[PDB]
Amino acid sequence: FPSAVTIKSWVDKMQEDLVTLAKTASGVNQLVDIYEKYQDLYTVEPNNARQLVEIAARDIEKLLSNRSKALVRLALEAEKVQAAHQWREDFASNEVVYYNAKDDEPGSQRIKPVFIEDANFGRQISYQHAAVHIPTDIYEGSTIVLNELNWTSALDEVFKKNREEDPSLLWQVFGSATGLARYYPASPWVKIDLYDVRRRPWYIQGAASPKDMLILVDVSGSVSGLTLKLIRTSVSEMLETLSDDDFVNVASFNSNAQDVSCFQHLVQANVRNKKVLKDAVNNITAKGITDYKKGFSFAFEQLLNYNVSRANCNKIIMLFTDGGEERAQEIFNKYNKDKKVRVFTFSVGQHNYDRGPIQWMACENKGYYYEIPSIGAIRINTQEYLDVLGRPMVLAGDKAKQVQWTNVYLDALELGLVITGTLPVFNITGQFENKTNLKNQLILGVMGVDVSLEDIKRLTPRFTLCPNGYYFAIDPNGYVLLHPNLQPKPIGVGIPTINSQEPVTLDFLDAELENDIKVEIRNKMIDGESGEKTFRTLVKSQDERYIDKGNRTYTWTPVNGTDYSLALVLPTYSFYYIKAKLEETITQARYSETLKPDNFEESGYTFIAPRDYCNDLKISDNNTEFLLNFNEFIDRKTPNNPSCNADLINRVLLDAGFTNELVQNYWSKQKNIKGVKARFVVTDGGITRVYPKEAGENWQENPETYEDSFYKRSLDNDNYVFTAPYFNKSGPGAYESGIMVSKAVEIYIQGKLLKPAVVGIKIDVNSWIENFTKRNSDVMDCVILDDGGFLLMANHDDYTNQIGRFFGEIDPSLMRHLVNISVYAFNKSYDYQSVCEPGAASKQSCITEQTQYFFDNDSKSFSGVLDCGNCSRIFHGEKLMNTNLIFIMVESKGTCPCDTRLLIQAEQTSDGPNPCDMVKQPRYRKGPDVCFDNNVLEDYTDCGGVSG
Amino acid sequence: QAVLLLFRCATGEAWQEIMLACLPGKLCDPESDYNPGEEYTCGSNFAI
Amino acid sequence: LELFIGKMHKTCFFADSDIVAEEDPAPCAFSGNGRQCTANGTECRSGWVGPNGGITNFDNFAFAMLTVFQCITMEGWTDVLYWMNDAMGFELPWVY
Amino acid sequence: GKFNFDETQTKRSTFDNFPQALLTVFQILTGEDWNAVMYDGIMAYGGP
Ligand SMILES: *[C@@H]1O[C@H](CO)[C@@H](O[C@@H]2O[C@H](CO)[C@@H](O[C@@H]3O[C@H](CO)[C@@H](O[C@@H]4O[C@H](CO)[C@@H](O)[C@H](O)[C@H]4NC(C)=O)[C@H](O)[C@H]3NC(C)=O)[C@H](O)[C@H]2NC(C)=O)[C@H](O)[C@H]1NC(C)=O
Ligand SMILES: *[C@@H]1O[C@H](CO)[C@@H](O[C@@H]2O[C@H](CO)[C@@H](O[C@@H]3O[C@H](CO)[C@@H](O)[C@H](O)[C@H]3NC(C)=O)[C@H](O)[C@H]2NC(C)=O)[C@H](O)[C@H]1NC(C)=O
Ligand SMILES: *[C@@H]1O[C@H](CO)[C@@H](O[C@@H]2O[C@H](CO)[C@@H](O)[C@H](O)[C@H]2NC(C)=O)[C@H](O)[C@H]1NC(C)=O
Ligand SMILES: *[C@@H]1O[C@H](CO)[C@@H](O[C@@H]2O[C@H](CO)[C@@H](O)[C@H](O)[C@H]2NC(C)=O)[C@H](O)[C@H]1NC(C)=O
Ligand SMILES: *[C@@H]1O[C@H](CO)[C@@H](O[C@@H]2O[C@H](CO)[C@@H](O)[C@H](O)[C@H]2NC(C)=O)[C@H](O)[C@H]1NC(C)=O
């Protein structure tokens, strides 16, 4: 084994070979000179974080105020129009004219519309009228439906009036309590149909207030058989009506009351928690005698806990039973004398047991009585309890009409991620003289207007920021309304085993890597206070394979029209940006001439970022043709550009000249270099330049520069970054492309740091072997790894064959010992929006755990001995200077025949974290301040008996 | 097969359910020849 | 017992699965002589419990005696006759 | 109470209480569908 001095000098020669090759071939200093050479085609502008967040938060507040005004103007007409309705009972003569969706008539006439296709809508629509959706299990043409189908026809004019001031208005929907939903503009509905507007999350939040639910399940002997199957189905279909603001728990009683799950108190009832309760419900068996006093005493004690986070709102007890002779009136006179807890009772199944006590239980405690004889009645009887809970809110009047916004969810009409406004509509008939007040305490329905997340993204431009800088808005519950890591996919829970209705609620701590400092920032944003903090953060790469640590600055302010809070993540070296100023005619024609596809042989293969340069230039996702449209638009349009912004076009044109002048003046002289296969320049303007036409066909990176993983990683590092290729024969690239090396250019205009572009080359692996050799020994092994433990230059041929592979999958014994001696740290995190192939108990969404390795210690020299069973193995570790590489030499595994378990660094399916202990110490959250319950004027005399 | 059905009715197995299955509103096989369109006319009220 | 033991054990499941295709399953042909399921994507293999949950069959002396006593009381005898028609064919079971 | 094994439907000819027991015994005497009740009672004890 050679000495430390003889190995330190051996790696010293190669680190000069690698750095000098990349320094000169790419021409890092040449690009720096070009930017400094002119200094007059552009100006340096400051990037004030504090000013940006307030401006962006003002636009979001103003946008949500247009929709709020479009809702009060929409709900006022519905209240007034309905109060003038006469309730006709025969429509055979005066037929109702409406358009019914999902189609190609006793008392209705159908409309066949025109259905013109347009943009900002994924489907064909029509502004002439409003479509009407009726659930399958609801008969159109009934008196209840037909009467509702008339007075809602007056909403068509106010639907048009709302859209005239704001042509950028998305779906406007009225969800009636009868079941039908009328939306504008008219468009066809999207296998059988199971959509009910009354069960949608946006309808539910406007129907009532948050609630502290507690489900009591009867698991005595008499419920065994079919009526246990209906009880478990009714409970499961009822937890589907609970949002993130509602706290629920499930208990069972059969001569003894206990919790059915691992929670033991009220839990937030989010996506993960509701899965645990749902899983625990379909596990209960029926056995024992019935004890109602013990069941209700246990239930009333959990509602009075106050140690854990609750809703501090509607307190309700749900009793799922069949029948008994026990009234338990001694418990109700002890635990709720003030009637602060509602009791809803359900009699489930086909039986002959006494329902009298069950009916009496729900009548004294302001509840309601429900019958569920078969499966067909399960879905509708588990949602009518919101009529009772909305009674106090109706009597409030004008102070209960506040606009609310939902969690981020996928639109039913295939529109993407949207949020919906909410405002209830009340019966008003007879309220002018205040004489009816009989059905006037039930809402007519809920109004709603959809706001797409792409609408919000247009209010927070990000092309003047560094690719590492981004905006991100938060929610009171902590979830993210806006984030680069939020994807239009449902969040997965558990592991999918086989033998989109849920909202996309992604917490802030789950969007990016968690930190002790970041938790404090999250809590300061939730309670709505402005601030700022600069601290060192370790950042996960765009491709989940690397972790790098760099300084970041977080600046947040509350959007205090709504309850959201907006923040702007901005690193250093990005408080200034290059602003292009150029109005000369011939200097842009020459720059635009460099974009012609024909002369790539003299200027290199050129890519263009599919930015929204002008409104008439559609994105293409092809770039080969998109550039053809872009440059043909430049010469076929007056350069004044009155319809689109010149700032986003002046930058790309200015960067076109700078990249070309490097190619013509520097790259053209060296036609071929021994160790170079390709040379690329990626800039902030949004262009890529690969000099060889043949090598430009292997560029698999995203044309958008802000989405390039190597571009973002090279800005954080202050040295050449080696990016390992992929594996598993994922197309071409192993040997015929090369190894990518990049280095971000830094310019100093007036004492200001700026990183406008990156440059790099692709070192061929085969010629690097020749330099490395100056081989396949059976007694020694020499490998080169980067920051992340990926192979880049091996020694044993077969090792070099599996290039760009994690070192733990080819030598687990050495990799595990490296982590222990603190040279390769690792941080594990969960990906809640991932799709994985299901296993045994196409594809389904699941949680996948990610692992990323990075350099822990700053020290460059490592040495030591590892023992793997009656053998002593020695090794030396030296790290290349000005590079993220490490050279490790160890004798071959043949000497010591040991083989431990492989160490996998890949997207591995998991089901964690455990939800049974997260509820013990939940994350901080703030609940709504509106609480509408316990109103004295409530009638509640119709308990369950007037109906039968 | 007809004799077997008659024996089944003689033992009184499900004779009323056989009777209810011979009413006019029944489908009969395309193997038999009949005017197109009128396909459910086979079956007679004399079954009772 | 002598004529037929364990013939009513082949109903037509879905292809490459273990779920019975029909809601009221009936046996296939034991040797390709009785009834064959000709539903799109169905095949049958000997792995079925039996017509009445295994209570009605001729694969035991007690089971055969119970079936004979059930048939001699003119109760559900045609059900067993038709199941054997589905299993074997149309010539032997009617005599028995 | 042992006739709650099917979990998919509710059975009418049971021994749930005295009137239903009397009705089921009378039905067994008449011989109509006595084998169905026998199967139900057999499957109530595990099966074949
Ligand atoms: C907002 O509130 C108003 C009033 O507060 C409410 O309008 C009232 O609607 C009911 C219908 O539910 C009208 O009731 C009338 O009287 C009886 C009661 O239903 C009906 O007669 C039969 O009733 C049975 C039920 O008991 C029903 O099954 C049957 O179909 C009915 N018809 C028969 C047997 O022919 C009358 O038909 C019904 N209508 C009349 C007499 O025109 C009230 O009269 C209405 N009150 C007022 C002041 O107009 C309105 O529906 C609420 N809004 C919504 C969206 O529901
Ligand atoms: C519920 O349906 C009713 C019938 O379908 C609607 O009632 C009809 O509305 C028509 C137009 O609004 C009326 O036509 C005109 O009414 C005015 C009185 O305001 C008069 O000039 C005439 O009666 C008539 N003019 C003409 C025909 O040129 C109908 O008179 C009226 N009644 C009927 C047809 O019996 C309701 O409007 C509808 N409710 C809602 C809320 O839209
Ligand atoms: C939130 O509301 C407050 C006041 O309601 C706004 O505070 C303003 O702050 C600026 C500079 O700090 C002052 O010049 C104004 O006078 C303040 N407003 C008032 C009414 O005094 C704050 O701007 C709001 N939040 C946002 C994002 O605009
Ligand atoms: C938390 O809940 C418990 C019971 O649900 C409350 O009762 C006290 O519990 C703590 C120990 O957990 C002790 O102080 C006593 O055993 C209980 N009584 C009193 C008067 O303290 C408790 O008050 C609730 N709050 C806290 C902060 O523990
Ligand atoms: C990311 O990785 C770091 C480095 O291992 C981890 O934080 C270290 O945790 C250990 C023990 O838990 C401490 O002794 C170190 O001082 C920590 N280093 C730090 C905080 O820099 C942890 O896994 C992750 N740290 C984060 C996310 O901040």
Ligand SMILES: C(=C\c1ccccc1)/CN1CCN(C(c2ccccc2)c2ccccc2)CC1
């Ligand atoms: C079944 C015979 C049968 C009927 C229809 C079809 C096939 C067989 C056996 N026996 C059962 C009892 N029944 C009769 C019966 C009549 C006379 C004597 C004995 C019994 C009965 C049963 C219950 C209550 C009152 C009367 C008469 C027939």
Ligand SMILES: *[C@@H]1O[C@H](CO)[C@@H](O)[C@H](O)[C@H]1NC(C)=O
């Ligand atoms: C809508 O919001 C925009 C800001 O997004 C604002 O400028 C405008 O005044 C609002 N109202 C209308 C009718 O456009």
Ligand SMILES: [Ca+2]
């Ligand atoms: Ca009971």
Ligand SMILES: [Ca+2]
């Ligand atoms: Ca009979």
